[PDB]
Design an enzyme around this catalytic site. Structure first.
Site, PDB file in Angstrom:
ATOM      1  CB  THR A 129      -0.930  -2.063  -7.239  1.00 28.48           C
ATOM      2  OG1 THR A 129      -1.641  -2.819  -6.256  1.00 28.48           O
ATOM      3  CG2 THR A 129      -0.775  -2.902  -8.493  1.00 28.48           C
ATOM      4  CB  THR A 130       2.832   0.569  -3.197  1.00 26.71           C
ATOM      5  OG1 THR A 130       3.272  -0.751  -2.865  1.00 26.71           O
ATOM      6  CG2 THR A 130       2.884   1.434  -1.982  1.00 26.71           C
ATOM      7  N   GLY A 174      -3.385  -1.596  -1.969  1.00 27.74           N
ATOM      8  CA  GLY A 174      -2.455  -2.352  -2.781  1.00 27.74           C
ATOM      9  C   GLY A 174      -1.897  -3.570  -2.081  1.00 27.74           C
ATOM     10  CD  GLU A 183       4.119   0.517  -7.856  1.00 23.31           C
ATOM     11  OE1 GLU A 183       4.992   0.395  -8.733  1.00 23.31           O
ATOM     12  OE2 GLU A 183       3.106  -0.197  -7.793  1.00 23.31           O
ATOM     13  CB  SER A 189       5.468  -2.544  -5.446  1.00 26.88           C
ATOM     14  OG  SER A 189       4.128  -2.874  -5.149  1.00 26.88           O
TER      15      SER A 189
END
EC number: 3.4.25.1
Lengths: 203, 227, 227, 227, 227, 227, 203, 227, 227
Positions: A1-2, A128, A17, A169
């Protein structure tokens, strides 16, 4: 979860993303993690999906109510303080979220809020699981004298370097650019693909 | 001897206190509005007052949302409390369903709130009437909400002291699906024929919405064209 | 000197406030309905009003469920609150038992709610009468609920200003198990003989249900046949 | 000047409001009942009304349980609320003790409920009298409950407009342990001698129970024998 | 102009509503009782009524416990509620201390309950007087509790319409420690001298207790001896 | 027109309802008391009543504790409730501080309780005055508490119908530190000079305490000495 | 408890199976897992049976009330948002369910809701214990240009491939097809058996 | 017709009930006080009463703390309740901030408490005025709090029946920073010129504080010097 | 006959009690203020009173924050309660949003609080009008809040007994963006022309703020220049 968000001279660039995974198993390859909560303000959620979406709806409604009954936009530090109080009233039955707030009132700001309610302003921030890779890229190439195009190239380079080493991710890249003249502008998919092709990356 | 309590019926079966609220509405200035080809407008008469007053806070038309808006007539304190309740109920509807899907249940919340005070002792009703108008999933909408809570969806209406004369004009002149400009000028003539002799129509606040767009309020010089 | 409180008896033993609610019901327009061979219908008179009014919101007949429906007469605000309570009570019965098994307990909830306000001080009663009609596990049903809460199951009735004349006609003309069309025309004649001299019957809203089917509302040109 | 509040005594020491509820009971039609050799019956006069009314919902006699039953006289709304409370209290007694052991405490619940409203301001009493009758662990029972909450167990009684004449007849004619038929005919003569001159006794609803059996309601042609 | 509220003093300083409760007690029939050599008795006059009434439920004397008992006079509904409260308070005292140790605090509970309603607006007092009598750890007891809550322990008393005449007789004739029979006959003469001329004393219910024994009610033929 | 509510001031600024409580206190019999050399006493007049009354329950003097005691005058029901509240407040003080350290805060609890009802509508005040007396850590104490809650510590006082005459005698005759006997006889003369002509002083209840001792009530023959 | 739902051009195909088992022991060989909650909307429950049926009754009543008092059907995103709020108000005393919502308002939608309240729209989705086998079949044969008959064949093939390797799934196959022209249509048992016979499968 | 409720305005806009509390304050005896060079004093007139009264409990001056003190005038029961509330609020302030930092918020607590009862129906106001005086972190303080809650910090004041005459004297004679003795004698002359002709000034209670010291009350012979 | 309750409309539709609060505001002394080139000022007339009063507590102008301030007129107790509520609402706004962002919602909290008491029975309204003024994120602000809760943003106003004359002067003389001194002198002339003949303008308290600065109150000798 960047997630990532950087500041420039009179601009805020925020990029995420899109992959939703809570297992070693990929549920959805196309999610939403970048929202617009005011005219000149965005917010990236990262953490637990349900609590994140509830906080998004609660912030959008209250910002819209304030804007309608005061005829001016709410300042970014007031947004971060309100959200900090909302998270810290329930600190023993907490929310599992970790989010960023960025916007423009007279100068570009980026706030970073954790799950207990501590909001600290910084120049650039990243939340993230790919946040150490993003902080590794941004430690060696960030400069304050960069232009808007170079910033858009930098956040794409950072997220594309975090996508290679983090298994949680991946997917396409949302990029939104906030400016006082043009407002909240979200860049099109073909333009992001053109950026990726001219830099020399894949997917 | 019966017009003293909100909870007592006359031997005819009337609620005189409810009707005295309807007399309190009648003391406010005229405000009209109607729908047209893809959208709805609102017109509100203002007898221009002291130049010391900031013009941002004498607007009878108020934006509840980017897609719903209304106008009042009657007691000014109750009017302000009611438009506040309309805004808060719009926000609650928008957060429980994702968006303001129908204008009708916003008008329903306001209507039930205004109705409840016409039933219990120790409370007086609101002496305000409201005209809602906007765009929803269905299209152009136009209501009016009276002190007793009765709501009715119209194609053209007015409220205030002129109400009978304006709805009398619109009852014999209004034709639907006018393009925005012609509609506004018909409404201006409707507002004109409600004044008394010698009175000159000053500049009224007028605003409109079309399907797929937000509101905009015609500023005073776009208003000044149709004088 | 005793018609001022809901909670005081006359030396005869009457409740004059309760009866003034009966005088408030009498000011509403006539609406009738009866059952027939596999189903029930409803007829409601409407003196046609301003063409600016959207016709979807002047219907005295309202669908509470796909299988129950009703019609009111009296105060319009209390009427709207009552049909809302009927809808919510139908939903509660349907979720606690799986389906609306009997119409009678829906009518019972509405009746107890209307009855309670005829007993306590500081509250006035509802000035509305309601006629329920539909299909249940038993078959065709037809009630009327008055302001005091009294419910009675009929085979034919009316409410409103004409009620005495229509029930007087039906008391000497109605014969059960008519096929739907003949029933509707008998009810139209019943509605006709309640008007005053010179008055022409305008188009009334009429709707019906049969055993195994949902409702449908006869549109104005299917209505127009029986004029 | 004292018959306005439920909570004020006259200088004699009377409760005029409680007595006006008793004047409200007197306007209902006559209903009687008595016990006999192994069981109790109930008789209720009905002046026959509109044929559009379904006969299931004009029965003054009502089954609270398979082994208890009652009949009312007075206000119809309060009457229905009271027989509902009798049913619910019967179910609560039956679930807390395994069965309806004594009819007397069911009558006690109804009596205390009716008594409480004759003491507090802001509430009016019930204008209904009830005659309970059934079979318990002891045997045949027969009560009457008035508006003030006074209960008394009888061997024969009536309520309603005829009450004085019927209890005057039974006071000089009734002899206990009659076999069921003879008892019913004595009660029919009791009901006959309470009418006014010219009035013909129409068909009354009559029902009974014997020790070891449930209720049954004599249908109209078994009623028709004793005319 | 001051006898309308329970909470207002006269300029003398009287409570006229409290005294009208004393006028309400005066309408009940005479009931007396006194203690003697090891025990206490109770006598209650009954003008014999309709033979249809079951005699188990016209007894003015009631057993609260096997060792305490009482008799009332006044309003029948309030009388029944008070003897119920006496029974429940006796059970609560018996469970918190293991046994009904003193009769005085049972009488105290009843007295405080009756006193509280003579102080607060919106409540009327009880129009009943009660005479308690029984055996405790101390011995024979005899109280009377009036509507205002005043309790006083006696050796002989009456209540009801005859009260002044019976206490006038006992004030000049009663001598303590009589053996049970002689005591009962003195009390019968006390009850006799309170009637009016021409009235014949019918059969009164009489019951007694001795130290170490429970109650017993003299049946009507043991009563019949002392006529 | 102002002596109807406890909460309304006259244009002078008087509370007429509070003063009518002072008129209600005046109807009770005289009771006095004073302190002396190491201790305090109390004298209470009793016009001797019916010999049927047990003498244990006509004592105007009552022991709240072994070291505090009091006497009342006024309404008997309110008097009993007040001496009960005095006992319970004494127990609460004794358990929170280990002992009844000061009599003054017991009198404070009673005073605030009596004061509160002279301020709120829907409640009438207590028509009783109380005279407390006892021994604490400081020594002999003597208060009086009136209906409005005003407390004042005295060296000699009275209450009741004679109060003015007894305090007039004590105002010109009383000298402190008398040995117990001489004090009692001075108080008996004080009680004597308050009666009317022809009235003979019957036997009054008198009791006393000394520093380091408990109470004792002089029995009737120790009383009989000072006649 | 295999469920599946895919979208096409103006059609939604939702299919389940029918076996109720909470042990290594089969209680019932014929259950209900596919419901109809509006005119153009269905819902598949998978998880705990009691909580599932309570959510079904609560959604059916509230959708019917909204339809009656507004005279228009509720949009699918509003249905998913309402159900997300209902699940997330009690997130600490949760429901053990995992459900799908599909329907047609102007375009076909499929929403996937978890037990905490996170609703993510995707093209095709699958919940249950046979969901990895269903995602394995649908990864290699799904195409957007497929017709309605080929979609009905595909979901039958996917569930019949999940029934062979998962011990907790089996029985007959419910199939429902949602179209704007024809409404909610549930395919008959003999037609499903004809599909299975012409493909070449068993049971 | 408007001086009956605390919550109703006259057509001038006066609160007659609030002013009748101000007429009730006027019936109390005169009490004055002022600040001087490092400190403040208080003087209170007492017309000497019955010698039976212990002098510790007729002191109009009361010590709330070792550093704050006050004096009242008006109704004695409300006066006592108010000085109790002042003590408790002083303790709460002292425990939440470590010390009584400012006298002003103690006076604020008392003022808001007295103000609240002049706004709500069913409650009457306090008919007492209070004069606070003491030493804080700032220095000498002197307030007065009236029935409506209005507080004002002074350099010299009075309350009671003489108030106008004493403040009239101090308005033309008082000069600040007097050494304590000269200040006291000026205040004694101020108290003298408020009496009526023939009245001799008896001994008034007087007390004072200086910066860095506690209170002390001048005993009667230090008082006796300035007669 | 209608000016007795806050909750009853006249047959015109007026609230006479709300208007009598507006008559109670009229009895207070004149206070004005207006905005200018980067900032706003306030002027308040004071008829100078007793020199014993400490001047810190007669200031009609009060600092709610370092950046907002206000002035009252009317009842002094309600005025103090209102400025307290303004301070507390300013603190709550400042803690929930980080700073007092807009003055308008502080004025909104005060306005809704004052509006609520003009609707419910058993409560009287506030008889005070307030003029807020300060600097926010937008710039100079200036409101007035009346008893009914109506707020309006101005460029120049007054309140009190002179209000009509001062706003009449400012309506024909005021010109915006004056440098601070010239603005103050125009406001002094505005205050001058509202007095009656013979009255000399004493020294008024005047204070101001500019954009980027805090408040300061002109002391009496900076005031003394513009006399």
């Amino acid at each position: 979860t960047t997630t990532v968000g950087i500041t420039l001279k009179d601009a805020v660039i925020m990029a995420t993303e899109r992959r939703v995974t809570m297992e070693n198993f990929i549920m959805h390859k196309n999610g939403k993690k970048l929202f617009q909560i005011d005219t000149y303000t965005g917010m990236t959620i990262a953490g637990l999906v349900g609590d994140a979406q509830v906080l998004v709806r609660y912030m959008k409604a209250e910002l819209e109510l304030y804007r309608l009954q005061r005829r001016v936009n709410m300042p970014i530090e007031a947004v971060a303080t309100l959200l900090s109080n909302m998270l810290n009233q329930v600190k023993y039955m907490p929310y599992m979220v970790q989010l960023l707030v960025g916007g423009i009132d007279t100068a570009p700001h980026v706030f970073s809020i954790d799950a207990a309610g501590g909001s600290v302003e910084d120049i650039y921030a990243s939340t993230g699981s790919g946040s150490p890779f993003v902080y590794g890229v941004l430690e060696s190439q960030y400069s304050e004298k960069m232009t808007v195009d170079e910033g858009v190239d930098l956040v794409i380079r950072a997220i594309s370097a975090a996508k290679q080493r983090d298994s949680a991710s991946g997917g396409m890249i949302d990029v939104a650019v906030i400016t006082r003249k043009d407002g909240y502008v979200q860049l099109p998919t073909d333009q992001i693909e053109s950026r990726i092709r001219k830099l020399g990356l894949i997917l | 001897a019966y017009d003293r309590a909100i909870t007592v019926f006359s031997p005819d079966g009337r609620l005189f206190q409810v009707e005295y609220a309807l007399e309190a509405v009648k003391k406010g200035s005229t405000a009209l509005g109607m729908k047209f080809a893809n959208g709805v407008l609102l017109i509100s008469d203002k007898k221009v007052r002291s130049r010391l007053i900031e013009q941002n806070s004498i607007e009878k038309i108020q934006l509840i949302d980017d897609y719903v808006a209304a106008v009042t007539s009657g007691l000014v304190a109750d009017a302000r409390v009611l438009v506040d309740f309309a805004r808060i109920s719009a926000q609650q509807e928008k957060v429980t369903y994702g968006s303001l899907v129908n204008i009708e249940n916003l008008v329903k919340r306001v209507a039930d709130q205004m109705q409840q005070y016409t039933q219990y002792g120790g409370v007086r009703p609101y002496g305000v009437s409201l005209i809602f108008a906007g765009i929803d999933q269905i299209g152009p909408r136009l209501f009016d909400c009276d002190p007793a809570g009765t709501i009715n969806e119209y194609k053209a209406t007015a409220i205030g002291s002129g109400k009978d004369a304006v709805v009398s004009f619109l009852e014999r002149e209004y034709k639907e699906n006018l393009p925005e400009k012609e509609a506004v000028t018909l409404g201006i003539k409707a507002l004109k024929s409600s004044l008394e002799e010698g009175e000159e129509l000053k500049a009224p606040e007028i605003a409109s919405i079309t399907v797929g767009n937000k509101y905009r309020i015609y500023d005073q010089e776009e208003v000044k064209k149709f004088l």
